[PDB]
């Protein structure tokens, strides 16, 4: 029986449950418990009424799903977008259960959304919306229950309002009720670069397993936003060189090496990578064929496909963006012997630092930049190592290994606790 | 914007929503606020895992909806049925908002359900399902927040289980967390005949508005279940003659009067109304056109239609069943000038006594049967008179007016309380 | 298996335990649940340190027991006596469960004790002892959890201290946390005469059942404290003739009848019955054999015995005292055809007015003396009626029947509720 | 002047209380406060009903005792054994107050027990038993109140179930509600070897004070389970010579020494020590009389007894077990000038790691094995240092000095906080 409240096509949720299906062969004694993964623990649909600037009331659909809770409080961001749907928010929570268990955070999986176009609202209106939403899901929330975070179209500003609103309602300041707060509000050092640095940490852990030296290595990187330039800087700081960067404006190439800091100025200065004087322009499609040690897809989804996977000369692909390589491209890349570090752990840097933020918030005692990076390495190098060991011991690719690890840990937590009530 | 999570399906929810649309022209300055009735305040969808008797785990869908909370805690029964759906549970909670506001109960509108065939579960499995569902909806529940009740395929037994579960969870005995409990557990006297008694009380109020004498009046009753037979008993006991009852098995007719206590012994033993010694059989289609003062449909829906409305010679129709008369049949009865006491207030006796149960539960001081009946009478005549009054002011029929009374009160609570947060 | 922490012997507990055993044959399908009655739900032993007037600290043993809580919160007094023991507090809690169920109060049974001789403490030390105890048992207290009352060597003064200690500790006025409070603090009117009035109400109900007229009737009364002189006032004010009163002095007798107010005036002067101008003296032994309609023992335990029970000529014995008759006396009175209204319900007026205090405390609305006495008649006539019905049903004496009604109500609440967790 | 609810012989508790007496002469100005240690603050006795696999209900005695709670929340294992009595749970809670204080953990003393033979139950019955128990003692539990742990016949499995029952009852993730959990649920690393390592760390501190060389020092060890083999391993890794080992199968002596890792996989194959190819057999009472520097009794209680203490020719006895020396055996070992590091600090490795578990659980941030170990040394060296100095300052044996430090720290806490309420 699929879930009756989704109707004939279950959409994004079906895609999630199919992946649980595919992981079932590798679960051993835990396999029967896998059924619990195909239904969310808790779905909460709330109305969120908002007095608009004219003084009239608008009504919005807000959601908060706790996909699974066996391993700890629900954790997962909150998205404002006109195309938000029950189905998607459930699926996304399902992915957070997987991601958080694969990287070894002490959390279950949760997500939230409000179906609204935030570009149609004033800053005032957005504030009132965040506040009402926070109040409405208040029965879910707590640093030991469910810790929202930023997602599509939300950030530090919204997170301050959730915090502030839960803290006023509840009668005390509780910084850890959300993460991705500003520093001033109990936020954490090292958030901005977390993800791009974690791509490097995980890429470099793979390189040691295959005896690839980092100091010599060449790097090509797609996307130069927060993740891309952070990855760029880390590779460049460890002795590697960035020989090409592609983004939405154009592509630039220089086998001798591009300076990430130098390029970045130009990126805000003009708008994109195009016209960087210390490199030559390159056609969109050739980027993928460059002889490199490291390729970092850190931009849009569906960028390494059946159409170009044969062109890839990289020894290691480290996934910065969510889902940059298609299932077809995986098969091709496995064939060509290229190591793919899956988005699941490769991009987990941000979620790890927000875990760090939750942690510092309990006794309001904040860590230095350097303790953040050191502890970020410990978490992600341990996640790469556990995913590597499973990939070897079961003869599956790293991506399949990541989902086996995740499911295995959630299902072990559940087997231990037992069924109660 | 209709609710996106329903999909282009309205179903039972769209029927509720259209009734709201139909009331808007009578709402005056409260009208803009009617939009709020077209979205439940909250929906909670839960997974209810249950260890079956065969050692395996089954997963059921549970729902608890709070449609509107403005006049009070959400109040409404819980249904166990394999056809239970999100949209159904929403719509029924919407009708609860409306029923409570028209009967004048200090409650909001709630509803719950499990998608399960209880026929297929043993008593043990049923217990374990009930406990886990009540644990799962724990966060909603409490005498001041949400009070479930029996509905389709649940009764005393399930209510005992819900009370004890929540009580054990919270380490206090909290009798008022559900209603329809057994007396031994803080139930209320008078509950069984309540709805039936209430059909009469409503028909009597109606009678007094048109100068119709109850002593010596003739009644015909379709349905001889808990509602039907208690309504007959009430009528008899206030001096009316029951002359015809139509059943499953047929119709019996006798102008001298049928003793309902005698007839009941027959329906209990023999199996149904057919073959009752002290009356003659009657052909089903002849029931509707009989010369009588009161007609009480207390059986299935859509029993009074275009096909038979013109034959009805009753001065008062009192709706014991939900939806026994079609809108077309309404228009006909209006044209003939027969008063229709609408199901919304007419069959509210059971709901009114559950409320008395919750009242009594707050200090565990229990009322006598007579006291229950007298306070029941107060509630139901207050409800009739309020509807009558709106019916006369706006020149609309009783049915419309009951819906107008409900909406006006809910929006009135909301207008005074205001928008917060 | 017997309770290990009591060891071999009992002793008050094994006595209660045996009464449970004797009731089992009459329990029907509830019989296998009766084992639960032979174990306290909860036993709390506290140390109560108290600063003495001389500046030193002393350490007293404190106890609170919840024998059974299937029917409602624990209810029972706190006793201060140097011979208080764990075993005794347990058995007394057992007797509270039975008592509350037999009279039909919505309460489980509890008891408390402190092992202290209160004659040797100053009022200042007794306040400090009371305040510390209530604190130590506070995890247990609350109007919906556990409601203490006065008992041996406690009264209004220390109930006022318990209420205050709990209230201050919890930050709210919670009058309903204990009963037996001063009326200035949310006590109930009608407390002084409750037990005596109850002895009458219950006697008169028995009289009805045997066609015995109260107006004609002669009454002998042992004891003339609160229970005895209120019983006497009640009997006289309903047209009965009080012909004999025995006190700690001696006995007075008058066939024409004694005015109990005039007697009471004479006792408040002379300190007891004796030389009462309007009655002749009688030797103590002639008292029990007086030809009367009603005999009321309202003094100490064990006053009706193998020694004097065979001499009784009364048609009705109505037990005002706690256990005034021995089991061997019950056997004798049974053969002689004398009706014994058992103490469990006969003396319950006090405990019922405490119930009323608690009920009134929920919303701080207090009833008139007229209302308390009407409501008290209702409780005790109902209690007597239920005991009567089981006595006839099962062909057993009233005493035994009271124990059966009690154990049935407890066990039925337990069966309905189920076993959880 | 003993507690009334234990009778004239209080067995275990009397022994604890007698031990408090003998400590009073060393307490200085805190000596009058010592009476407080002769009472348990709180004794809770629950009934724990379980549904058996055969459908019938069994009732078990459950206990939780808080001996003292001045220094912090209560801390102590829960034991399932058919010999568990109120007296014993009390004693063990008392020893826990001493132990926790002696090592400098921020905990008061507690202990639980169920009186049951767990070998008579199926794993399902053992679960339902565990969950009922944790429910019944619910009112006591919380990371800031009472934090249970494993003891006789309990382990990781029961703890998981306690964490789960409690977390579900309360609707929050609360890992720190018990310790000794699986790592997957918030357990700590380094729990397997903690006691073993502690025995060594604590034996070394004793050496570094009596001018004893660890290195070439010969070590005899009774018991080769978790405690024994980790002790041998750390003695070995620190240059020492494991010359003898005795578990249940026999004893294996070897002048030249035994490499424990080699001995381990031998016991992890043939069942015990008995058949070890790389040593000669010279058992059994011979083992005790061996000329050694370190004797580690790490098996059962009462092993070094008033009947075999004579043979002992070791310089330092380091107690890995609980109570491996009778008091008469202490006198003889004092006589021969042999150092006995008392079990109260010598085996406190496990309890320190439990403390670390609880610490890590507050923000769910988990320490490396290297960190656990450095932190465990820091704690156990400080404990010894404090115990040593008092043994010297007051010229008393190491065991008595630990008890004195323990009594002093508790009473100082009690004196600083003062008496209240
Ligand atoms: N006792 C929990 C297991 C943990 C979980 O699933 O979150 C349950 O039955 O659901
Ligand atoms: N939007 C991402 C990241 C949030 C974060 O920075 O913690 C999520 O839901 O997990
Ligand atoms: N099924 C009805 C029952 C009302 C009641 O008996 O309390 C409801 O849900 O409103
Ligand atoms: N403050 C409430 C009032 C209406 C209600 O309680 O439903 C709101 O804006 O939602
Ligand atoms: N000592 C009485 C209570 C006194 C009262 O409530 O009036 C009892 O425990 O039953
Ligand atoms: N659920 C309760 C029912 C009986 C009671 O409340 O005492 C139990 O298992 O013990
Ligand atoms: N069984 C020991 C140690 C438990 C632990 O490892 O923390 C106790 O109850 O104190
Ligand atoms: N105020 C506490 C201090 C000792 C403790 O906390 O146990 C008391 O009177 O007992
Ligand atoms: N993902
Ligand atoms: N009323």
DSSP string, C154-179: --HHHHHHHHHHHHHHHTS--GGG-S
Q: What is the DSSP letter of D187?
A: P
CA nearest to B221, candidates B121, B324, B127: B324
Please, what's the b/e burial string for B236-261 (b: 16 or more CB within 10 A of its CB; e: otherwise)? beeebbbbbbbbebbbbbbeeebbbe
| Strand order through the sheet with D294-297 | D241-246, D218-222, D294-297, D316-318, D339-341
Would you state the structure tokens that stand for residue D220, as one six-digit string? Answer: 């005899």
- Rounded to whole angstroms, how far apart are CA atoms D280 and A382? 45
Backbone φ, ψ for residue C215 (5° rounding): -45, -60
Interface chains of chain C (3 or more CB pairs under 8 Å):
A, B, D
Q: Exposure pattern of C278-309 as b/e (b: 16+ CB <10 Å)?
A: ebeebeeeebbebebbbbbbbbeeebbeeebb
Dig out the tokens for C336 from the structure. 């002689």
Task: Please list, in sequence order, all residues whose beta carbon lies within 8 angstroms of the beta carbon of residue B392, skipping any fewer than 6 positions away.
Answer: none
Facing residues of D49 across strands?
D59
Assess B54–A contact: CB distance below 8 Å, yes or no.
no
Tell me if residue B190 falls in helix, strand or coil. Answer: coil
Distance CA A404, CA A383 (A): 13
Show which residues of B are catalytic: 111
Task: Please give the sequence-ordered ranges of beta strands (E in DSSP) within C21-80, or none if there are none.
Answer: 42-51, 57-68, 74-80
Binding site annotation covers D96? yes
What are the tokens at B362?
């707050």
**What whole-number distance in Å separates Cα of residue D203 and Cα of residue B377?**
85
The set of protein residues with a Cβ atom below 6 angstroms from ligand 6 is B 164, 168; C 69-70, 414, 417-420
Using CA atoms, how far apart are residues C347 and C329, in angstroms rounded to an integer? 19
How far apart CA B59 and CA C220 sit, in angstroms, is: 70
Whole-angstrom Cα distance, residue D407 to residue B241?
88
Helix ranges (H only) for C188-259 are: 194-209, 226-237
Q: What is the pairing mode between strands C316-318 and C339-341? A: parallel
Q: Which of C133, C78, C75, C83 is nearest to C105 (CA)?
A: C75
Distance CA B326, CA B305 (A): 6
Quote the CA–CA distance of D154 and D160 in Å, as a whole number.
Answer: 11
C-alpha B230/C-alpha B236 separation (Å) is 10
Task: Give the position of tokens 């808080």.
Answer: D66
Contact flag B45-A131 (C-beta cutoff 8 Å): no
| Max CA separation in chain C (angstroms) | 67
Question: Phi/psi at B159 (nearest 5 deg)?
Answer: -55, -45
The encoded tokens of residue B16 equal: 């509720």
Which residues are within 8 A (CB) of C120 and not within 5 positions of it... i.e. 6 or more apart?
none
Paired tokens of A176: 């850890």
Q: The dihedral of CA A136, A139, A142, A145: what is its sign?
A: negative
- Integer-rounded Cα Rg, in Å, for chain C is 22
Give the count of beta carbons closer than 10 Å to the beta carbon of residue D277.
7
Q: For residue B64, what is the enclosing H or E element?
A: strand B57-68
Helix (H, G, I), strand (E, B) or coil at A31: helix
Report how far residue B362's alpha carbon sits from residue B355's, in angstroms, rounded to the nearest whole number.
Answer: 11
- Chain-centroid distance of CA D160 in Å reads 21
Query: For residue B368, what is the DSSP state?
Result: P
Cβ contacts of residue C30 below 8 Å, gap of 6+?
C407, C408, C411, C412, C415
- C-alpha A10/C-alpha A212 separation (Å) is 43
**Maximum distance among all alpha carbons in chain B?**
66
Q: What does the alpha-carbon distance between residue C270 and residue C265 come to, in Å, rounded to a whole number?
A: 9
C408-421 exposure pattern, b = at least 16 Cβ within 10 A, e = fewer: bbbbbbbebbebbb
Cis peptide before D175 (omega within 30 of 0): no
Strands A74-75 and A108-114: parallel
Cβ atoms of D176 and D186 closer than 8 Å:
yes
Q: Could A36 and B59 be called an inter-chain contact, meaning their C-beta atoms sit closer than 8 Å?
A: yes
Is residue D162 within a helix (H) or strand (E), and if so which, with residue range? helix D156-170
D21 class by beta-carbon count within 10 Å (0-12 exposed, 13-18 middle, 19+ buried): exposed
Cα torsion angle, C156, C162, C163, C164, sign: positive
Residue C200 to residue D96: CA distance in whole angstroms: 57
Is A56 within 8 Å of A133 (Cβ atoms)?
no
Looking at residue A368, what DSSP letter applies?
P
Residue C229, phi then psi, degrees to nearest 5: -80, -20
β B42-51/A42-51 pair status: antiparallel
> Please, is C339 exposed, middle or buried when counting C-beta atoms within 10 Å of its C-beta (0-12, 13-18, 19+)?
buried
Reading the block at residue B375, the tokens are 């306070």
For residue A5, report the phi and psi dihedrals to the nearest 5 degrees.
-80, 5
Which of A145, A378, A412 lies nearest to residue D172, judging by beta carbons? Answer: A145
On whether the CB atoms of residues B78 and B113 are closer than 8 A, the answer is yes
* Residue C257 CA from chain centroid, whole number: 29
Give Cα C261 distance to the centre of its chain.
Answer: 25
**Within 10 Å of residue A171's Cβ, how many Cβ atoms?**
7
Residues A374-409 as b or e (16 or more Cβ within 10 Å = b): ebbbebbeebbebbbebbeeeebebbbbbbbbbbbb
H-assigned helices in A218-276: 226-237, 260-270
Q: Is some CB atom of chain A closer than 8 A to the CB atom of C421?
A: yes
Degrees to nearest 5, angle at CA A32 with A29 and A33: 95
Residues 6+ apart with CB under 8 A from D187: D156, D179, D180, D181, D357
Give the separation between CA D291 and CA D309, rounded to whole angstroms.
Answer: 13
Please say whether the beta carbons of B305 and B329 come within 8 A: yes
Please state whether D316 falls in left (phi above 0), alpha (psi between -120 and 50) or beta.
beta
Backbone dihedral angles phi then psi of residue D314, each to the nearest 5 degrees: -90, 155
> Residue D112, Cβ neighbours under 10 Å: how many?
30
Chain A residues close to D127, C-beta within 8 Å: 418
Peptide bond before D421: cis, by omega within 30 degrees of 0?
Answer: yes
The full length of chain A comes to 421
Judged by DSSP in three states, A18 sits in helix
Bin C223: left if φ > 0, else alpha if -120 < ψ < 50, else beta. Answer: left
What residues have CB less than 8 Å from D349, skipping those under 6 apart? D193, D194, D195, D196, D197, D198, D199, D201, D376, D380
Contact D233, D263 (CB under 8 A): no
Residue B213 in tokens: 């004498």
How is residue D122 written in tokens?
């199926």
Closest partner residue to C417 (CB to CB) among B160, B362, B366 is: B160
Tokens of C223: 């004891």
Contact B57, B49 (CB under 8 A): yes
Distance CA D155, CA A416 (A): 12
Pairing of strands C42-51, C57-68: antiparallel
Separation of alpha carbons A130 and A166, rounded Å: 11
B378: its two tokens = 């107060």
* C chain contacts of residue A420, beta-carbon cutoff 8 Å: 421
Rounded CA-CA distance D353/D190 in Å is 7
Question: Residue holding tokens 């109007």?
Answer: C143
CB hemisphere CA count around B102 (13 angstroms): 32
Q: C76 CB under 6 A from ligand 5?
A: yes
Residue A414, ligand 1, Cβ within 6 A: yes
Contacts for B232 with CB less than 8 Å, ≥ 6 apart: B196, B219, B221, B224, B242, B245, B260, B263
Alpha-helical runs (H) found in D271-348: 327-335, 343-346
B380, B383, B371: which is closest to B190 by C-alpha?
A: B371
* DSSP symbol at A243: E
Q: Are strands A280-281 and A251-258 parallel, antiparallel or unpaired?
A: antiparallel
Contacts of C49 in chain D (CB under 8 A): 36, 39, 419
Question: Would you state the structure tokens that stand for residue B344, as one six-digit string?
Answer: 């919304």
Any idea which residue has 């409501």 for tokens? Answer: C375
Is D168–A359 a contact, with Cβ atoms under 8 angstroms apart?
no
Answer for the pair A149, A75: CB distance below 8 angstroms, yes or no.
yes
Contact between A354 and A335 under an 8 Å Cβ cutoff? The reply is: no
3-state helix, strand, coil in chain D (%, to 5): 50, 15, 35
- Looking at the complex, does the CB of residue A420 fall below 8 Å from at least one CB of chain C? yes
Determine the longest span between alpha carbons in chain D, in angstroms: 66
Alpha-carbon gap, residue C150 to A174, rounded angstroms: 44
CB A185: neighbour CB atoms within 10 A? 16
Confirm if D151 and D77 have CB atoms less than 8 A apart: yes
Of C42, C51, C61, the CB nearest to D4: C61
- The sign of the torsion formed by the CA atoms of D171, D173, D176, D179 equals positive
Instruction: State the Cα–Cα distance between residues D39 and C61, nearest whole angstrom.
Output: 9
Q: Locate tokens 């015990």: which residue?
A: D272
3-state SS assignment for residue A252: strand
Where are the extended beta strands (E) located within D101-173? 108-114, 146-150
What 3-state class would DSSP assign to D402? helix
The answer to whether the CB of A107 falls within 8 A of the CB of A70 is no
Q: Which of D31, D40, D47, D74 has the most C C-beta neighbours within 10 Å, making it the best mutation to test the interface with C?
A: D47
Cβ atoms < 10 Å from Cβ of A355: 25
How was this entry determined? X-ray
Q: Is B365 annotated as a binding residue?
A: no
Q: Work out the end-to-end distance of chain A between its first and last CA atoms, rounded to an integer number of angstroms.
A: 23
Task: Give B-chain residues touching C72 at CB under 8 angstroms.
Answer: 173, 364
Tell me the C-alpha distance between D311 and D338, whole Å. 12
Instruction: Round to whole Å and give the CA distance between D37 and D33.
Output: 8
Determine how β-strand D42-51 pairs with β-strand C42-51.
Answer: antiparallel
CA of residue A242 relative to chain centroid, distance: 24
Q: Do the Cβ atoms of C186 and C156 come closer than 8 Å?
A: no
B and D: number of Cβ contacts within 8 A: 7
Spell out the alpha helix ranges (H) of B28-119: 86-103
Residues in chain B: 421
Round to whole Å and give the CA distance between C143 and C172: 13
| Per-residue DSSP letter, B51 | E
Strand partners, A280: A253
User: Among all chains, which residue has been given the structure tokens 């409070």?
Assistant: C181
Cα separation, B93 vs B65, whole angstroms = 6
C302 to C22, C79, C93, C328: CA distances (angstroms)? 21, 21, 21, 11
D142 interface with B at CB cutoff 8 Å: no
Tokens of B69: 């909370």
Could you tell me if residue B55 is left (phi over 0), alpha (psi between -120 and 50 degrees) or otherwise beta?
left
Can you tell me the distance from the alpha carbon of D108 to that of D69, in angstroms, rounded to the nearest whole number? 4
Other Cβ atoms less than 10 A from the Cβ of C123: the count is: 9
**Separation CA C381–CA C324 (nearest Å):** 22
d(CA B61, CA B87): 13
Helix (H) or strand (E) holding C335: helix C327-335
Q: What is the helix (H) or strand (E) element at residue C276, kind and residue range?
A: none
Q: What is the C-alpha separation between B64 and B136, in angstroms, rounded? A: 10
Output the six-digit token pair for C263. 């007697």
Q: C301 and C222 in contact (C-beta within 8 Å)?
A: no
Cα separation, C303 vs C313, whole angstroms: 15
Sketch out chain D's domains with CATH numbers: 1-37+397-421 (1.10.8.1210), 38-173 (3.40.50.10860), 193-347 (3.40.50.720)
Coil vs helix vs strand at B62: strand
Residues A330, A401: contact at Cβ < 8 Å?
Answer: no
Q: How far apart are CA C285 and CA C366, in angstroms?
A: 45
- DSSP for residue C66: E
Contact C146, C64 (CB under 8 A): yes
């Amino acid at each position: 029986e699929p879930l009756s409240y989704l109707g004939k096509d279950g959409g994004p949720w079906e895609i999630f449950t199919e992946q649980v299906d595919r992981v079932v062969p590798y679960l051993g004694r835990l396999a029967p418990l896998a059924e619990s993964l195909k239904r969310p623990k808790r779905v909460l649909i709330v109305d969120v009424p908002v007095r608009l600037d004219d003084g009239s009331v608008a009504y919005f659909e807000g959601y908060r799903v706790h996909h699974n809770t066996a391993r700890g409080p629900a954790k997962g961001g909150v998205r404002y977008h006109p195309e938000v749907t029950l189905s998607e928010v459930m699926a996304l929570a399902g992915w957070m259960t997987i991601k958080n268990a694969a990287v070894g955070l002490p959390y279950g999986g949760g997500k939230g959304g409000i179906r609204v176009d935030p570009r149609k609202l004033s800053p005032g209106e957005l504030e009132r919306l965040t506040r009402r939403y926070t109040s409405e899901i208040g029965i879910l929330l707590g640093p030991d229950r469910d810790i929202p975070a930023p997602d599509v179209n939300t950030g530090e500003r919204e997170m301050a309002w959730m915090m502030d609103t839960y803290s006023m309602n509840v009668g005390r300041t509780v910084p850890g009720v959300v993460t991705g707060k500003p520093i001033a509000l109990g936020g954490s050092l090292g958030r901005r670069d977390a993800t791009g640095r974690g791509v490097f940490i995980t890429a470099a852990a793979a390189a040691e397993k295959i005896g690839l030296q980092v100091e010599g290595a060449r790097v090509a990187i797609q996307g130069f936003g927060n993740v891309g330039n952070a990855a760029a800087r880390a590779f460049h700081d460890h002795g590697a060189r960035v020989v090409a960067v592609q983004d939405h404006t154009g592509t630039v190439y220089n086998e001798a090496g591009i300076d990430p800091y130098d390029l970045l100025r130009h990126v805000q200065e003009f708008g994109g990578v195009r016209g960087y004087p210390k490199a030559e322009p390159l056609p969109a499609a050739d980027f993928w064929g460059l002889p490199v040690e490291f390729l970092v897809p850190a931009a849009l989804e569906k960028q390494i496909t059946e159409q170009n996977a044969w062109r890839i000369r990289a020894r290691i692909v480290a996934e910065g963006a969510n889902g940059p390589t298609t299932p077809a491209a995986d098969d091709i890349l496995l064939e060509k012997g290229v190591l793919v570090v899956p988005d699941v752990i490769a991009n987990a840097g941000g979620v790890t630092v927000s875990y760090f933020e939750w942690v510092q918030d309990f006794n309001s005692y904040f860590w230095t930049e350097e303790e953040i990076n050191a502890r970020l390495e410990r978490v992600l190098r341990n996640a790469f190592e556990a995913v590597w060991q499973v990939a070897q011991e079961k003869k599956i690719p790293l991506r399949t290994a990541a989902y086996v690890v995740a499911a295995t840990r959630v299902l072990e937590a559940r087997a231990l606790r037992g069924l109660y009530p």
